[PDB]
Symmetry: C3
Subunit: 436 residues, 3 copies
Amino acid sequence: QETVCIFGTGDFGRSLGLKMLQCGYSVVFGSRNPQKTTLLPSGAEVLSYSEAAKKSGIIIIAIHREHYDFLTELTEVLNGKILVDISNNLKINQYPESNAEYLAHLVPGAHVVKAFNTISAWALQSGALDASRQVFVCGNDSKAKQRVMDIVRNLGLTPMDQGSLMAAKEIEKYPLQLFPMWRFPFYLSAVLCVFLFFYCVIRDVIYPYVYEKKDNTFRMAISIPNRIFPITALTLLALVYLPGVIAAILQLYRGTKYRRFPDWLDHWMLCRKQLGLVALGFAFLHVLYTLVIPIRYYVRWRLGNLTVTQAILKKENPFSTSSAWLSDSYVALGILGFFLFVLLGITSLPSVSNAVNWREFRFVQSKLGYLTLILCTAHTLVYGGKRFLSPSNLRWYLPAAYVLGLIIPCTVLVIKFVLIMPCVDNTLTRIRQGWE
Amino acid sequence: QETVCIFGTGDFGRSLGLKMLQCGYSVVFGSRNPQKTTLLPSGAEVLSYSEAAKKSGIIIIAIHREHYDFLTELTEVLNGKILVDISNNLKINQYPESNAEYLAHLVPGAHVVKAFNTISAWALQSGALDASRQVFVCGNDSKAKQRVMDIVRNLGLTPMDQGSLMAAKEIEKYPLQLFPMWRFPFYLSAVLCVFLFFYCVIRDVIYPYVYEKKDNTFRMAISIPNRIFPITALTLLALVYLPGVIAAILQLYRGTKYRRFPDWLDHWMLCRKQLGLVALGFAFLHVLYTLVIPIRYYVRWRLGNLTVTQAILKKENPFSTSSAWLSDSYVALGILGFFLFVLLGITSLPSVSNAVNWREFRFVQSKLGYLTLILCTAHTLVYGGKRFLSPSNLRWYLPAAYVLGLIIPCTVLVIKFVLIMPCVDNTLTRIRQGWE
Amino acid sequence: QETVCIFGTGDFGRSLGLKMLQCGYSVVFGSRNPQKTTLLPSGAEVLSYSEAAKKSGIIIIAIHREHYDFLTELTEVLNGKILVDISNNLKINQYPESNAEYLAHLVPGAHVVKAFNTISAWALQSGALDASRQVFVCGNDSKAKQRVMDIVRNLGLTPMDQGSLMAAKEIEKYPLQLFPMWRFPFYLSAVLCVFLFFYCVIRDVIYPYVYEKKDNTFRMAISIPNRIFPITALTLLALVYLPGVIAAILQLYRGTKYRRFPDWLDHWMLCRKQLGLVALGFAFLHVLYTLVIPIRYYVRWRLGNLTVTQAILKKENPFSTSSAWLSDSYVALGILGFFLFVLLGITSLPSVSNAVNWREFRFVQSKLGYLTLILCTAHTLVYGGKRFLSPSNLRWYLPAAYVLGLIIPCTVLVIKFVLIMPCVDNTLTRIRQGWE
Ligand SMILES: Cc1cc2nc3c(=O)[nH]c(=O)nc-3n(C[C@H](O)[C@H](O)[C@H](O)COP(=O)(O)OP(=O)(O)OC[C@H]3O[C@@H](n4cnc5c(N)ncnc54)[C@H](O)[C@@H]3O)c2cc1C
Ligand SMILES: Cc1cc2nc3c(=O)[nH]c(=O)nc-3n(C[C@H](O)[C@H](O)[C@H](O)COP(=O)(O)OP(=O)(O)OC[C@H]3O[C@@H](n4cnc5c(N)ncnc54)[C@H](O)[C@@H]3O)c2cc1C
Ligand SMILES: Cc1cc2nc3c(=O)[nH]c(=O)nc-3n(C[C@H](O)[C@H](O)[C@H](O)COP(=O)(O)OP(=O)(O)OC[C@H]3O[C@@H](n4cnc5c(N)ncnc54)[C@H](O)[C@@H]3O)c2cc1C
Ligand SMILES: NC(=O)c1ccc[n+]([C@@H]2O[C@H](COP(=O)([O-])OP(=O)(O)OC[C@H]3O[C@@H](n4cnc5c(N)ncnc54)[C@H](OP(=O)(O)O)[C@@H]3O)[C@@H](O)[C@H]2O)c1
Ligand SMILES: NC(=O)c1ccc[n+]([C@@H]2O[C@H](COP(=O)([O-])OP(=O)(O)OC[C@H]3O[C@@H](n4cnc5c(N)ncnc54)[C@H](OP(=O)(O)O)[C@@H]3O)[C@@H](O)[C@H]2O)c1
Ligand SMILES: NC(=O)c1ccc[n+]([C@@H]2O[C@H](COP(=O)([O-])OP(=O)(O)OC[C@H]3O[C@@H](n4cnc5c(N)ncnc54)[C@H](OP(=O)(O)O)[C@@H]3O)[C@@H](O)[C@H]2O)c1
Ligand code: HEM
Ligand code: HEM
Ligand code: HEM
Ligand SMILES: CCCCCC(=O)OC[C@H](COP(=O)(O)O)OC(=O)CCCCC
Ligand SMILES: CCCCCC(=O)OC[C@H](COP(=O)(O)O)OC(=O)CCCCC
Ligand SMILES: CCCCCC(=O)OC[C@H](COP(=O)(O)O)OC(=O)CCCCC
Ligand SMILES: *[C@@H]1O[C@H](CO)[C@@H](O)[C@H](O)[C@H]1NC(C)=O
Ligand SMILES: *[C@@H]1O[C@H](CO)[C@@H](O)[C@H](O)[C@H]1NC(C)=O
Ligand SMILES: *[C@@H]1O[C@H](CO)[C@@H](O)[C@H](O)[C@H]1NC(C)=O
């Protein structure tokens, strides 16, 4: 039966130690005081640091980085042992090297393996290990690394091997972050949903209060967020396919592809997935606010008054078939534009993305990605055809609030249309392999 | 070229043997009667048990557990061989030890590897291996276990290593179950959709038949299941976040977190995912029944009569703006409450759940999980404001059937609000690390 | 520090070489002209072919298959080296053996490992490696194959081991295909959406133009694709469960299950997933076109005229409760039939499909798959009950265009109902294990 020593009897020391007694391991704890040990599992004795290290070959140090000082006092006991470093830091970039690098320079005669820092101490105890299922294992000694990965499999976890000990810097960065790539689409969308809220409140509830004095302030429940949410979804969709256009222009002037993107475009290349899925989250709200139009009281009342007024005044509507074209056209373009929008979101799942090679992925994400941005722009051009862009449409001196949201998507489609023409695109094909 | 012996020429023996002839293996079957062999592949000879075992090093026993008796008669031939045990049982907990444990005690001088019990014999033959793609491999000998995993890769399958031979008890439990965790949310929801069907039939089709005698029995097609399905979705959502409240209370009285939950709460901790996804399945039905309201005949007729009666009787509706607030408010709260409801369901996918550490998962599942249960409770409080809870709302002595569904969600939100206050929550922070 | 030689300084040679300088490898390029080397990374010298191969043990040949001729001129240098073959072909089935097989016959004294052909040269450079994350590694020498997989882990990629070198034929087929299994459901659906477009244009816009001359040509925006898309979704759903019925008939005549399906049924067995997900894509369009009915101008106008005409002509509608049954029945059957339709699509995800054994998968995909095809057929039978199949329903001599779409689903449900009866099904149970 295997023996696993655990330095430190703290929170994660008890939780990892009690998980190993349930899987058939003889755990020998090591603490500063083996005399007074109140909370400990049943079949696990507690010894000194030098005494417990003489019993196993795998030593898990469940201590913080600041108290790594005593390991130099017993470096002749730790010769040939497997020291599993599990520690995290309180914040990113607190120390220059990682902990497993620093633990290797303290005890040079021992094989250091980074593991177990992703999982939490409560997930081992309660058994509610759902996102803390994978354990990232990295180390230099390949024989010692396969032995630690056998413990992770016997504890019901899934070891993901991360290579050599150089990858321990990124593993300690992993449990500290809270959506690091989603920060720029959240901040861009929040400053675009606040500006476009104050832009529609000034048009729809303030302008009918100054002129033609009426309350009209219920609009900011559904009727104003059904203008914020599609225009935010259309703008953020156009901000997705804009770096691929700016980078295509920036390669034509340079004449080569082997130079580096200018450090603001490169960070905005990597947030396209994050900008795309936030734009799907707002387009999905625009669908739900639109499909619930005929349930609202204002829509039932307005269609109720318009029918009664037509009933007592014997004038009639002669069914203009031109307006039946437009109202069935922009609704149809919005449905095809949302079907492909969802289809880009299905492919964004990390299991669907791995069952797809880079040609099938480029066909969905780029060929059917502009075709989303064409249909979602034609959905709001044909909707703009009913309003005609007349001078009776701007309230003070500021227009109908969707034509501001057509500046970025119609800019992307014009510049992309230049890059499709063979006087330019045949140069791009010769530049994706190398050119002067 | 490799040689793989297969004991037993039955259903899975032919299916696994014919799959290995298509991948470049020389398969030697072993049966009780090598003389009469009718159904067999082409390039695979059939020998005796002792004769076929002298030709390979990997022996796959395609026999049941009851006929393991003959292997003790030839235990001197099986020395050093790799015996791959593939057997299942007819029911869970039929024998005390697993089959691979029992196969190791019969032949102690052989390395036993559990594999191939997850896949079916038809999925190897027809090639329709879709859920039977992963093959769970476990065994003590690490050199013999990597050799069996090389066969699984060459057969187009994906070996998932499960550790030592102690994990063979759970692998044999795997192909027998049929949604074992989903049993409690299915039985709770079925006894809550049956009671709430008879509660709405008594109010909506029986009470208009006794008093004011009219048929009114078409309601149980859409109009009654649009009352069952949201209240079942709201109750099951409140039953998700109720164990996290009961466990928080039960840690304050104990003063420590290291004691065990009382065996009914612990089984209801593990079914939160299962209760949550069933509650999303009923909320998704409540969306589809609601968005199809203006297509129904009863809604078109009632809005048709109410307009014609207002047309021939010249009284008018003066557009009460107060009721335009409420009807745009509970509809908006239902959309935000369903958007985050879906967002919890996207994170529940086992590929999205693994691309997310436990802080980003706790932010979605708990911070944005109560915020779902707040918005979905405020969606049905504001809907209850239109009905005012007047005494003309209860039919015999029993109320309007959604206020029964507000008992559990408003209980969770009150007790959670006590646990947020810093006179209690600062004790919870000191108790998630250890306290007296 | 490790040394990795790369033959060939081309497009993928620079991209893979610059990725390895960023991970702590000393890369030594090999080219035909080490004198003139313009584009190259900083810390990577360029030598001759025989000179650079004498410095490392891992040699990555970044050259095409046609220029493999020079490796026979230096086969005494490549003894014991690990030659990583990364090449692709311009088209499928261009050469009889794969490249890694052909590279092994050129240099017999070297271990050949196929890797890196899935990823692209731009994904290494730009860092936008999203679908080119997995690297398929296969080779005969297990010690050399684990060494190449350590490079793939250190480059931030994920090595998927594919077994021996026999699997290199399928890995070179992998980056060339563009949805190979989706071709038959795309071509079947396109020839069924074109025929059913011309069938509804002849009924709905040509027949009201010849008789009772009116424009009526706006129908082909929403109103005609809301007839194409559900009938295509219902037909393709019936074409899913039809091979399982034809194969069940074809096993009863044969009397055994061990014979081979006749090569058109076998290719249509494998496209059931592909036919099923395309049928979900059209049913999801039928939902979105249907839920947007009360927003269209034609529906608002027609319900506006029908109310005003009822307001000025004092006749009334007495609320036939029979038509309130039917219109709430087929709408309810369409919602239950679409809920299970989506539930089959959630299980089709390759992460949900792997978290499910073959009994839970057969319960969803087959037991709840016919129950989808029953409810979606009863959704269009009850919708056909409102139209009664009168002789005033066919326009010239051709019927109401959904009853053509009931031929295939009602054929499958009748023949499946024969196979459920125990005079037939007890023979199928005795034939799924072997019978004469
Ligand atoms: C809902 C949604 C989900 C999304 N999910 C994802 C996701 O999961 N992952 C993701 O990455 N994006 C995602 N996106 C973003 C979008 O799909 C990407 O932009 C897409 O992958 C490529 O778009 P592109 O037009 O910029 O093409 P790109 O190829 O990225 O950009 C074109 C330019 O890139 C350069 N380039 C491209 N290929 C090469 C080459 N072989 N050699 C040299 N230069 C080259 C050239 O300069 C070319 O002009 C998503 C978007 C949405 C709306
Ligand atoms: C649609 C949907 C999908 C869902 N999917 C999932 C899913 O995939 N997986 C899943 O697990 N749940 C899932 N849930 C359930 C829900 O998300 C969980 O309850 C959530 O993970 C945590 O909720 P909670 O408030 O109970 O928090 P919890 O943290 O589970 O409960 C709080 C209590 O737990 C204890 N506790 C928590 N953390 C610690 C700690 N570090 N140390 C000590 N004690 C601690 C304390 O007693 C604390 O008061 C889903 C729910 C829905 C509605
Ligand atoms: C939205 C959607 C998604 C889908 N996704 C998938 C998917 O991911 N993967 C997929 O495979 N299909 C998928 N399908 C197709 C459908 O689910 C399959 O047909 C289903 O897996 C089985 O259906 P079946 O009735 O043909 O059953 P089958 O079992 O495939 O066919 C029955 C016949 O198969 C033979 N047979 C079955 N089991 C055995 C056995 N043990 N021994 C001998 N003979 C046997 C017998 O002849 C039997 O009569 C999908 C369909 C839809 C609509
Ligand atoms: N959820 C988690 O707790 C979690 C999760 C992931 C990773 N980790 C990591 O696991 C390790 C355990 O930390 P923890 O959170 O569980 O807290 P902790 O173990 O309770 O406190 C740190 C441990 O250091 C030991 N130690 C030895 N000398 C010490 C000294 N001079 N001063 C203070 N302590 C000394 C202590 O045990 P003795 O005095 O008895 O010897 C003490 O148990 C940490 O590195 C942590 O980053 C924890
Ligand atoms: N879909 C599947 O079939 C499937 C799936 C997963 C796992 N398995 C497992 O694979 C194994 C094969 O079982 P099976 O379903 O395919 O049925 P089976 O093989 O047809 O019957 C059991 C086999 O035991 C052999 N055997 C040897 N001595 C025997 C004896 N005294 N009495 C009876 N049989 C004897 C028989 O072959 P000979 O008499 O010719 O030697 C017979 O082929 C089982 O353990 C099963 O749990 C099967
Ligand atoms: N996106 C990709 O580029 C990609 C992706 C996956 C796989 N691959 C594979 O990686 C390999 C590299 O090809 P590549 O696309 O990057 O084009 P390439 O390397 O620019 O051209 C082929 C290479 O062959 C070398 N070579 C040696 N003798 C040659 C000769 N007589 N004639 C022509 N070339 C000779 C050349 O380098 P020197 O003359 O300087 O020695 C040249 O760099 C290919 O096998 C490719 O299938 C490429
Ligand atoms: C289910 C599919 C969709 C339907 C039925 C739909 C329908 C509509 C309708 C009816 C309007 C007019 C709103 C009103 O009456 O005030 C509208 C506006 C709009 N839609 Fe959509 N839409 C859909 C999807 C999309 C998508 C995917 C986008 C792109 C992100 C989009 C962008 C817009 C924009 C920009 C407006 C104008 C916003 C305004 O100024 O009011 N829609 N949509
Ligand atoms: C798309 C989003 C949603 C919309 C538009 C919506 C709309 C509505 C409407 C209009 C009603 C009144 C039904 C009627 O007219 O008889 C209602 C009732 C209700 N909704 Fe929602 N809802 C949504 C999502 C949700 C969610 C996510 C929940 C929580 C599970 C929920 C819980 C309820 C409850 C409990 C009722 C009262 C049931 C009754 O007694 O009739 N809804 N909803
Ligand atoms: C959200 C769920 C669904 C709803 C509310 C729904 C509703 C309807 C409605 C109202 C119609 C009549 C269309 C019209 O007024 O012209 C219809 C037609 C039809 N539906 Fe559905 N449906 C649903 C899902 C499905 C599904 C999943 C299928 C099967 C693929 C299906 C198959 C059909 C067929 C075949 C027709 C007849 C097409 C025609 O001739 O017009 N539906 N549906
Ligand atoms: C508050 C927003 C939280 C959203 C969390 C989330 O969904 O992202 C988790 C992860 C994304 O994480 P990273 O790509 O690693 O940033 O999974 C997905 O790819 C999303 C696919 C979803 C496709 C439908
Ligand atoms: C009759 C109900 C059958 C449902 C089957 C199912 O969906 O669960 C399969 C599995 C769940 O299986 P377990 O978590 O292992 O119980 O995948 C999911 O996590 C669901 C995610 C779904 C998120 C949208
Ligand atoms: C133009 C159509 C492109 C569609 C691409 C696609 O979705 O398939 C990618 C892959 C399917 O690829 P293969 O099964 O390998 O053919 O993932 C899925 O299983 C789909 C699950 C989706 C379940 C919702
Ligand atoms: C209603 O429609 C009919 C034909 O569809 C038309 O003749 C009649 O004038 C309309 N009634 C109105 C517009 O009041
Ligand atoms: C219809 O609305 C107008 C203003 O919107 C109002 O003046 C008129 O009284 C309404 N007609 C009714 C209530 O019949
Ligand atoms: C409207 O409905 C009432 C009862 O709901 C009925 O008595 C009345 O006749 C209807 N008005 C019509 C049909 O014009």
